Amino acid sequence: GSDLGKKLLEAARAGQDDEVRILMANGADVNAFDHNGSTPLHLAAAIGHLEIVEVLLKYGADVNAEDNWGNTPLHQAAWVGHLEIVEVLLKNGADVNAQDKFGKTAFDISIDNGNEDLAEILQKLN
Amino acid sequence: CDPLCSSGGCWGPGPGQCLSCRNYSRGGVCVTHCNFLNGEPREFAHEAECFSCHPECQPMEGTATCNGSGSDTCAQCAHFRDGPHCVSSCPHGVLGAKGPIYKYPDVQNECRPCHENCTQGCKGPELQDCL
């Protein structure tokens, strides 16, 4: 599953949905991580591929995995304003109050970025 | 004993049942050689064991494809390069030390920085190249 996991990281990085599905069905390590500690779920959350995020969580991706800086995929999705991905990560057990290296939560990030739609979702969902 | 076992003998008939190998092994199975110049996955060797090259290394003809396991040890990237690493795609807001990193690929498929004011992606280095 390790060679497949390396491929999975690059398919999630490029937003290759069909490729991620084939790789998961073949037993790829869902919690593999690249040169930055980003897991496939961090890479999927960054580009905004909601279907890849859902497939990775179905195959057991760690919703609270941290990259080299302590960022979870909730931090990743909130920084780039991917609301739908934020809602799915939360439904699948993401710690809404997880803090980054500056002590900031997904809510703090949304306020820092002026994303009122994101801030409101975080308030309503928790 | 399979011809690929060392003089020490074997516990079974096949190449996966030697006490030790004559030279190379892949996953504990004795092989004639690693996939250095042909075959998939392309490989490098470390202490007579065969290990896979990173999938983003371009398979090379006649010469080695990598000298290590990382995407920073390829002879040539198959798609794009971000710093020392061969990648399928340039950063699309992936978090780094100071927040999301966005890059665009140049003519030579090298990932280059987006302007600091491109809150989303970019197709070039200028502020007018945002999105």
Numbering used by the authors:
A (entry chain A): 11 to 136
B (entry chain B): 481 to 611
Publication text:
One of the selected DARPins, D5, in complex with HER3d4 crystallized in two closely related crystal forms that diffracted to 2.3 and 2.0 Å resolution, respectively. The data processing suggested two different indexing solutions: either space group P21, with unit-cell parmeters a = 64.87, b = 62.25, c = 74.54 Å, β = 102.41°, or space group P212121, with unit-cell parmeters a = 62.26, b = 64.95, c = 144.90 Å. In the orthorhombic setting two complexes are related by the translational NCS vector (0.00, 0.76, 0.50). In fact, the diffraction data from the orthorhombic crystals can be processed in the monoclinic space group, albeit with significantly impaired merging statistics (R meas and R p.i.m. of 14.5% and 5.9%, respectively, in the monoclinic setting, compared with 7.8% and 2.3% in the orthorhombic setting for low-resolution data up to approximately 6 Å). A comparison of the lattices revealed that the packings are almost identical. The only obvious difference is a small shift between the ab planes relative to each other of less than 1 Å. Indeed, superposition of NCS-related chains within each of the crystal forms P21 and P212121 revealed root-mean-square deviations (r.m.s.d.s) for all atoms of 0.164 Å (1554 atoms) and 0.304 Å (1657 atoms), respectively. The L86Q framework mutation positions the hydrophilic Gln86 side chain between the Val574 and Leu575 side chains, where it forms hydrogen bonds to the HER3d4 main-chain atoms Gly573 O and Leu575 N, thus explaining its selection.
HER3 (ErbB3), which had long been neglected, has emerged as a key oncogene, regulating the activity of other receptors and being involved in progression and tumor escape in multiple types of cancer. Designed ankyrin-repeat proteins (DARPins) constitute a class of artificial repeat proteins that were developed as alternatives to antibodies. Here, the selection of DARPins targeting extracellular domain 4 of HER3 (HER3d4) is described. The DARPin D5 epitope comprises HER3d4 residues 568–577.
